[PDB]
Design a protein around this nucleic acid. Structure first.
Lengths: 292, 77, 93, 48, 1114, 49, 49
DNA sequence: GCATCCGTGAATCGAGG
DNA sequence: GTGTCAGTAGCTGTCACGGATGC
RNA sequence: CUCGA
């Protein structure tokens, strides 16, 4: 195990001296932002407190070196600088963490990356997306398997730029800038134009938890009155979705390629069977099997 | 008082660039409706480079801006 | 399109090569003028200008001065976006 | 058994059952008592 | 008759058992606690009649523990006493309006005693603004009603634990002596058969180090603990010996880095455990320890401190427990069993209520002031010092503010409906300071314990991550001054039930045997059957002879919560659906008009009244003048009291609190009668929902698994309509370039959108407003250096920007109220604010597709279709049903309640008449005579674990009244014949038809719908915001990304994680390409990944992106 | 371990006071351990992924 | 090292990476998902791309 | 050479305050 | 400029598991 | 913090 470490420095041609720092970097300000509160007071990122404590101890070390303080003070100060840089990089790693106000451990740089709230899992493996919505789901028995019903208001916001384009085309609005105001004021024209926009434009329905891939399926959207999403009764099984308050999210594929992927790969009619077992899922399940 | 990473503070939020982008998309549509010289002047004291007078500047600026206002209001701005 | 992503130990020289200047003073900002203190954790000479093309001393507030290093405050004149990528550094005694 | 058994299997842990196995094919040597259990195998071909 | 005490509607009960004690004040938990805190006359009288000797008010306790205050010499002294309160600063509603805190000034009497002069100056000192508890048990902090939740904490005392080693598979034992305050001390027996002690978390010292520090000789130690080889081995394996040696050995482990003086250690080792300064067991702690060790069992609770005797007897207890002993008598003490303690048992799990939680914060503030006083004494002169110069009340007010404002226990009151508030005030939380962390709560703290019987409810508890950590107080439960939860029991003398009721704690109850409430009893008191069901110590249930019963339960519903007791036929529902029902009753939305349920349980009356959201008459009299605004009562003696109604007030949760008078002009009303009821109330009973005509059948798949079908009647007649009120708020501050001004004159805004505004830019009262409309016109001056080049050009080719208060998306209603505060007009605003406007918008929400309904048995669903009144399957006489429940989602859940509830429901709507001729039928022999005849729309009660039996219900279905035409529509099975309103043909089979109580839960699509094209982006990560309120987007999580990768939709994944999120340039070009009609461009790089790189650099990691050639690219 | 005393009553007959209380042990621990089971399952899932 | 740092033991992986001076050949689903390249699967493989 | 103790990990999305 | 005693709160009510850490 | 599937 020691060789595993030493041979690294040997081959790669990087010096082990790197493990001891002569200079520490300062992260750009926008990543340690300082915001103002509605009461006139200020709130600041924890990194600022940590960097500040380190700077204080470093400048005090400069003072002590210049003033020829007793060796005890210089050494006992260098130790504090060590502890402070340790805290900057991975607070709490060694011993007791640096308590903030309220005996709360301050977040370190390496705390910006670990776990669910870390950069990796929170902001890289999964982002938040434009052109998306969510609402309560309702069973729509008259729907076909490839169809789903979404509220008019939802689709108007989702297809907002498309509606502006078509409105300015058919001269319902003078310029695109005015088309936007039309959509935001919800003038009655859009509802006849919106139908043209949503025509055969598939959308993706997701219900968390997204256990297997059939937890996300594609549908042809149908404008419905009301404010709930109408879901086909057969896909319930796939989504493991009852109707006792369950909510679903809708995503609008934009690029031609996204539309093609949804239309071919993810359409609910092209995903009847269970990828785990090969047995069918969108089949008569409850009331249906009883009637039959 | 507070800390940003403290659970109880808002988030520096930046607006959605919709308007600015639509404005520039119009401004760019009333630039094809121009002449290359008015264009080169507007996209910039400039009288030192383009090798013309400063009254020629003042004017070209003047008439060009009026052509721009004409086009814009033609579109209904 | 870029093939590989390399990672390795940062030499002191690399740390200094990144930084646009040393953070000497421990101050943050002024709580009245909202201006960042010079050579502090928000020094505009180091990390960048608070607003676009606006230097600290106020001599260059216009877009005409693109790339001028102000002589009275030492701030460069580009977009505030650079306050999201310019590194600082502390030189340890 | 149970879900912890699935974890035991997928993490290649030293299981709970820790059942032994015949390292060489041969004749069984049941030497059961009550104090303890000791079992030997006589290799069906050569071996020890 | 049910609830024949206030003057309430005669609800008839199927009760077989009599109530020997009527329900106590359901709000006593908060009330008595606070009254004890401030020592009100009511509390002192309650304690005087309870037999208490020298009772102490909370403030009095703090001031006595503090008094007196002396410096190191003792030449100066300061003492406090007699805390009193002036009148309240401002009334409750005014505080809510003006965003201040409800409080009263607290005065004490402090006096300064001078020893070097022999003269004392005693004066009154103002201590601070003391927050006061409303009559409804709530506090008011900065204009918001809050509730302080009772906390379940481990009781102080001595506890023993038997742990099992993982590796050596031997039984080890430990002990913890937990004080009410001070350092902790835990003994243990490691796996080497040696005894050790850890002092304040510090290193594990040998258990003989402590004895040596105390002056005990090693030979005397061998004398006491010689019967155990483990203690001999400890004294042998010991390192240092000597009284002055182990003392310093403790000192250098407890407070390292200091010179060790013999006296400097002798001082703290006595102060940390035997001086009342830095160590104190409350009276309860002393009592608990005195029992567990069996010493001082006769002494009055006066020693608030630990004694050496206690430690010696404790180590004896431990060492004996380790080696199998089962009995011990301390030298000079009573015999006591040797056992481990549960720490989940409600005799060891204490409950500290408001009073105590507040006393602790006051204590902290007071000690913080005490230190400042001791410093200020040795500073100022010793002749011009007054209590006023010594006292710095800053830390005390800061302490109470820090508690109320910031604490897990100071909770924003649940105010959906009165029952929600009541339950919230009767909550028992395990989380919080001194209790435990959520990450430190196993499957054992959370599950029901046999000691919760009659004390905490085993039903009402969240099902989320807080399950078991938050209970509700049982109905008849009360709190004793020590903190444990007492419950009442009827004393059984000689197989004879007595009306004598005694309250017992958990450990007190375990020392007897109690019989289940529903035991057959003689009219005199003797038990009919010799064997009776009985609960026994350690939660053991078994039969026992009648001559063995000591006590018995008060009422059958003794174990359940207020909410739980409101579930009819609860005894037929499974704990899961019953939990859901009790939890969803608290999510009921107050309806425009409220109907009490046909089928009740008796708890509705007292729930409503005790909840405090109704108006009860304090004193008897007559109604002089009644208006929709107020009600004046002319008492008999001659005085008048006027109750003002709260009309269209915004609840904490946007539900509408609106009280209406019940009595009329010139009506005689008795004391305690409800003269006006509020939301979810009808003649003083909890009306959380409506009585709906239900048909249990599948209907064309619109009610497929748990969806619900409703008759548009409920829309037309506003049967499930409810009011919701939103508060909108804007301010005008001082900016760097000027000051924001609220003005009707807004740049580039037509006169048509500004048509509804007054001269100030404020919307006018009564105006209907859609989402996006202007409410308050505020413009803020923007500087020139902040303008886009295209913006500056558009300004040149043609200085304030628009910051008006617009209506958020999805909101709409009538503007009912405005409130304006101006720094110019005396109104005190935060520094830098010149004006503030609050606009109140009320929406009248009819029942919509997707709104969530539910019953009382955890039977929940959403509205999947609202059919026209003619489509609904209608009964024989043409009356169409209202709601259609799918059958399939009924027998799986095991909520037979609704079934029963349904049947009785019908019986109550039509009435019945039992055949009295030829005697009383054999099924109704047990029914009270009041139930053999009933008029239609009659009110009834099914008390929990009592009430209607299935046989009696069968009979009642047999004798249901006919309709107006003389026809009986439902069969004795409970089913009736229905006609398909769509085709006309009657349905082939009979269907279960009845009446069920359905509640409108607070999960409406009008709130839960959301959608976003674009909008705000977090500055640091550049990813869209979260939440509907911030107009955010939905999160495409890791699992959903796995779903994408599974399908192989590569381009969709990329598009989701780039142009649709944090591709700064890509998202803009996508918007441009959509409005242009061009194709979607090629996604760029996510800014979040740039952030990752810069962070990895901030950790001295040199990350570089290389191209295919090998050159680092920037 | 199973209680040496059963729940004799059915939901159609009507549980006794103590019958409901003794049912709640199992019901509540069912909900609790189901939460825990889902947690462990999801973690195993992401590992397998 | 990017695929491993995003899984578990982020710090313990990044230290090893910086020591061994590891290079990540950006050719994996997790990694391309992180940086926003088309995943080398389904419609992203070279045959169909 | 081995027991202790350190560090790692522990479901998904969503609402309001 | 500083000068007699002048001394945390809080807390253990999680657990399985592997392997470096340490006697 | 409280809550919904």
């Amino acid at each position: 195990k020691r060789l595993k470490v030493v041979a690294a420095f040997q081959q790669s041609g990087n010096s082990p001296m790197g493990m001891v720092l002569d200079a520490v970097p300062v992260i750009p300000p926008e990543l340690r932002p300082m915001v103002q509160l509605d009461g006139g007071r200020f709130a600041t990122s924890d990194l600022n407190d940590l960097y500040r404590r380190v700077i204080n101890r470093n400048n005090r070390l400069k003072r002590l070196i210049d003033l020829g303080a007793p060796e005890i003070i210089v050494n006992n100060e260098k130790r504090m600088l060590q502890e402070s840089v340790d805290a900057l990089f991975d607070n709490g790693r060694r011993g007791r963490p640096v308590t903030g106000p309220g005996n709360r451990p301050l977040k370190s740089l390496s705390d910006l990356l670990k776990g669910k709230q870390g950069r990796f899992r929170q902001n890289l493996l999964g982002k938040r997306v434009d052109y998306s919505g969510r609402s309560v789901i309702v069973v729509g028995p008259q729907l076909k398997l490839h169809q789903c019903g979404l509220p008019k208001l939802m689709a108007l916001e989702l297809f907002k730029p498309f509606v502006m384009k078509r409105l300015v085309d058919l001269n319902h609005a003078q310029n695109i800038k005015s088309a936007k105001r039309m959509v935001e004021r919800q003038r009655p024209q859009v509802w006849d134009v919106l139908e043209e926009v949503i025509a055969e434009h598939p959308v993706l329905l997701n219900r968390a938890p997204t256990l297997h891939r059939l937890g996300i399926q594609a549908f042809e959207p149908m404008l419905v009155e009301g404010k709930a999403i109408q879901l086909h009764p057969l896909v319930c099984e796939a989504f493991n979705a009852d109707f006792d308050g369950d909510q679903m999210a809708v995503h609008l594929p934009l690029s031609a390629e996204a539309q093609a992927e949804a239309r071919i790969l993810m359409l609910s009619s092209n995903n009847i069977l269970s990828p785990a077992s090969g047995r069918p899922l969108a089949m008569p399940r409850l009331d249906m099997v009883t009637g039959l | 008082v507070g800390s940003t990473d403290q659970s109880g503070t808002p988030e520096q939020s930046t607006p959605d660039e919709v308007n600015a982008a639509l404005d520039r998309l119009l401004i760019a549509d009333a630039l094809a409706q121009l002449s290359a010289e008015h264009r080169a002047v507007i996209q910039r004291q400039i009288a030192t480079d383009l090798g013309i007078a400063e009254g020629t500047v003042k004017s070209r600026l003047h008439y060009a801006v009026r052509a721009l206002r004409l086009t814009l209001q033609e579109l209904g701005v | 399109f870029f093939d590989e992503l390399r990672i390795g130990l940062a030499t002191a020289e690399d740390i200094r090569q990144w930084s646009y200047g040393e953070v000497k003073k421990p101050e943050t900002i002024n709580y009245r003028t909202l201006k960042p203190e010079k050579d502090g954790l928000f020094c505009e000479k180091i990390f960048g200008p608070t607003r676009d093309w606006e230097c600290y001393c106020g001599k260059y507030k216009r877009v005409r001065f693109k790339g001028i290093i102000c002589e009275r405050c030492g701030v460069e004149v580009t977009r505030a976006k650079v306050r999201r990528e310019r590194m600082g550094h502390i030189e340890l005694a | 058994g149970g879900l912890p058994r699935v974890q035991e299997l997928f993490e290649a842990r030293v299981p709970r059952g820790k059942a032994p196995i015949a390292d060489v094919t041969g004749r069984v040597r049941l030497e059961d008592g009550e104090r303890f259990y000791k079992i030997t195998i006589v290799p069906d071909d050569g071996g020890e | 008759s049910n609830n024949s005490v206030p003057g309430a509607p005669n609800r008839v009960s199927f009760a077989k058992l009599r109530e020997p004690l009527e329900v106590p004040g359901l709000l006593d938990v908060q009330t008595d606690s606070f009254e004890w805190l401030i020592g009100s006359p009511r509390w002192r009288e309650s304690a005087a009649e309870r037999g208490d000797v020298n009772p102490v008010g909370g403030l009095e306790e703090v001031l006595y523990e503090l008094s007196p205050i002396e410096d190191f010499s003792g030449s100066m002294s300061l003492s406090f006493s007699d805390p009193r309160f002036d009148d309240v600063k401002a009334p409750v509603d005014e505080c809510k309006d003006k965003d201040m805190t409800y409080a009263a000034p607290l005065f004490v009497t402090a006096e300064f005693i001078n020893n070097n002069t022999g003269e004392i100056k005693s004066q009154t000192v103002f201590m601070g603004d003391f927050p006061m508890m409303t009559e409804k048990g709530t506090f008011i902090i900065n204009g918001t009603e809050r509730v302080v939740v009772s906390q379940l904490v481990r009781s102080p005392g001595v506890y023993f634990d038997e742990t099992i080693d993982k590796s050596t598979d031997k039984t080890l034992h430990s002990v913890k002596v937990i004080p009410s305050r001070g350092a902790w001390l835990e003994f243990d027996v490691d796996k080497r058969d040696t005894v050790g002690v850890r002092i304040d978390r510090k290193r594990r010292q040998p258990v003989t180090v402590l004895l040596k520090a105390l002056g005990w000789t090693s030979e005397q130690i061998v004398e006491r603990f010689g019967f155990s080889e483990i203690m001999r081995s400890t004294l042998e394996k010991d390192n240092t010996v000597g009284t002055d040696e182990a003392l310093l050995d403790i000192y250098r482990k407890l407070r390292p880095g200091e010179p060790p003086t013999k006296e400097s250690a002798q001082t703290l080792l006595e102060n940390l455990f035997f001086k009342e300064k830095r160590y104190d067991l409350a009276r309860v702690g002393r009592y608990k320890v005195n029992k567990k060790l069996g010493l001082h069992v006769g002494e009055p609770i006066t020693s608030s401190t630990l004694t050496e005797e206690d430690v010696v007897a404790t180590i004896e207890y431990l060492v004996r427990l380790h080696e199998g002993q089962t009995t011990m008598t301390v030298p000079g003490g009573v015999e006591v069993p040797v056992e481990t303690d549960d720490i989940d048992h409600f005799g060891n799990r204490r409950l500290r209520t408001v009073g105590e939680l507040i006393q602790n914060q006051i204590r902290v503030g007071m000690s913080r002031m005490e230190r400042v006083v001791r410093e200020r004494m040795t500073t100022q002169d010793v002749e011009a010092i007054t209590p006023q110069t010594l006292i710095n009340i800053r830390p005390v007010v800061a302490a109470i503010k820090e508690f109320f404002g910031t604490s897990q226990l100071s909770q924003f009151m649940d105010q959906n409906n009165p029952l929600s508030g009541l339950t919230h005030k009767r909550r028992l939380s395990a989380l919080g300071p001194g209790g435990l962390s959520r990450e430190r709560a196993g499957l054992e703290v959370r599950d029901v314990h046999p000691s919760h019987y009659g004390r905490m409810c085993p039903i009402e508890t969240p099902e989320g991550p807080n399950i078991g950590l938050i209970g509700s107080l049982s109905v008849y439960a009360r709190v004793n001054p020590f903190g444990f939860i007492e419950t009442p029991y009827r004393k059984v003398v000689d197989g004879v039930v007595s009306d004598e009721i005694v309250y017992l704690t958990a450990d007190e109850e375990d020392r007897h045997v109690v019989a289940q409430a529903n035991s057959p009893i003689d009219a005199d008191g003797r038990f009919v059957e010799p064997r009776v069901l009985v609960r026994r110590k350690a939660g053991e249930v078994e039969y026992v002879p009648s001559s063995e019963v000591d006590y018995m339960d008060v009422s059958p519903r003794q174990m359940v919560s207020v909410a739980t007791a409101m579930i009819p036929f609860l005894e037929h529902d499974d704990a899961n659906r019953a939990l859901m029902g009790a939890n969803m009753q608290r999510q009921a939305v107050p309806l425009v008009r409220s109907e009490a349920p046909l089928v009740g349980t008796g708890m509705e009356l007292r729930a409503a009244i005790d909840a405090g959201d109704v108006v009860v008459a304090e004193e008897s009299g007559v109604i002089e003048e009644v208006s929709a605004d107020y009600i004046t009562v002319m008492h008999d003696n001659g005085t008048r009291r006027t109750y003002r109604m709260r009309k269209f007030a915004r609840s904490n949760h946007g539900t509408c609190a609106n009280q209406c008078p019940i009595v009329d002009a010139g009506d005689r009303v008795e004391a305690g009668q409800v003269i006006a009821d509020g939301p979810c109330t009808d003649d003083g009973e909890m009306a959380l929902g409506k009585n709906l005509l239900v048909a249990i059948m599948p209907w064309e798949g619109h009610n497929y698994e748990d969806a619900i079908i409703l008759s548009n009647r409920l829309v037309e007649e506003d049967v499930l309509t409810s009011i919701h009120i939103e508060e909108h708020e804007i301010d005008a501050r001082d900016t760097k370039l000027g000051a924001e001004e609220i003005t009707r004159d807004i740049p580039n805004i037509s006169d048509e959108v500004l048509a509804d505004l007054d001269e100030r830019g404020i919307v006018r009262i009564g105006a209907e407003v859609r989402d996006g409309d202007i409410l308050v016109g505020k413009v803020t001056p923007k500087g020139e250096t902040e303008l886009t080049p295209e913006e500056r050009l558009l300004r040149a080719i043609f200085e304030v920007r628009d910051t008006s208060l617009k209506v958020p998306h999805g909101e709409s209603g009538k503007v009912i109220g405005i409130r304006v505060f101006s720094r110019e007009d005396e109104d005190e605003l935060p520094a830098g604010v010149n004006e503030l406007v609050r606009v109140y918008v009320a929406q009248k929400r009819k029942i919509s597709d997707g709104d969530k309904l539910a019953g009382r048995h955890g039977n929940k669903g959403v509205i999947g279709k609202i059919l026209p009144v003619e489509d609904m399957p209608f009964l024989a006489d043409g009356t169409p049903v209202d709601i259609i429940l799918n059958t399939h989602g009924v027998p799986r859940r095991m909520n037979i309640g609704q079934i029963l509830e349904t049947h009785l429901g019908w019986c109550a709507h039509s009435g019945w008449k039992v055949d009295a001729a030829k005697g009383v039928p054999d099924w109704a022999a047990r029914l009270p005579d009041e139930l053999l005849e009933a008029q239609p729309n009659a009110i009834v009660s099914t008390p929990v674990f009592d009430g209607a039996q299935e046989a009696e219900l069968q009979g009642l279905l047999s004798c249901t009244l006919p309709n107006r035409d003389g026809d009986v529509l439902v069969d004795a099975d409970g089913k009736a014949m229905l006609f398909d309103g769509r085709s006309g043909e009657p349905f082939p089979y009979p269907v279960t038809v009845g009446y069920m109580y359905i509640m409108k839960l607070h999960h409406l699509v009008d709130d839960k719908i959301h959608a976003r094209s674009t909008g705000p982006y977090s500055m640091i990560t550049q990813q869209p915001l979260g939440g509907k309120a911030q107009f955010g987007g939905q999160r495409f999580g890791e699992m959903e990304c796995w779903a994408m990768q599974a399908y192989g939709a590569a381009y969709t994944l990329q598009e989701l994680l780039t142009i649709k999120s944090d591709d700064t340039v890509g998202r803009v070009k996508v918007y441009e390409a959509i409005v242009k009609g061009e194709n979607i461009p090629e996604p760029g790089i996510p800014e979040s990944f740039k952030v990752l790189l810069k962070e990895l650099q901030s950790l001295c990691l040199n990350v570089e992106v290389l191209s295919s050639d090998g050159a680092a690219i920037e | 371990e199973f209680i040496p005393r059963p729940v004799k009553s059915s939901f159609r007959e009507g549980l006794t006071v103590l019958e409901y209380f003794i049912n709640t042990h199992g019901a509540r621990k069912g909900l609790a351990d189901t939460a825990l089971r889902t947690a462990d399952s999801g973690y195993l899932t992401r590992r397998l992924v | 090292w990017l695929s491993a740092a995003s899984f578990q033991e982020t710090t313990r992986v990044l230290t090893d990476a910086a020591i061994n001076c590891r290079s990540d050949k950006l050719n994996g689903l997790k990694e391309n998902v992180i940086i926003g390249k088309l995943i080398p699967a389904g419609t992203g493989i070279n045959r169909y791309r």
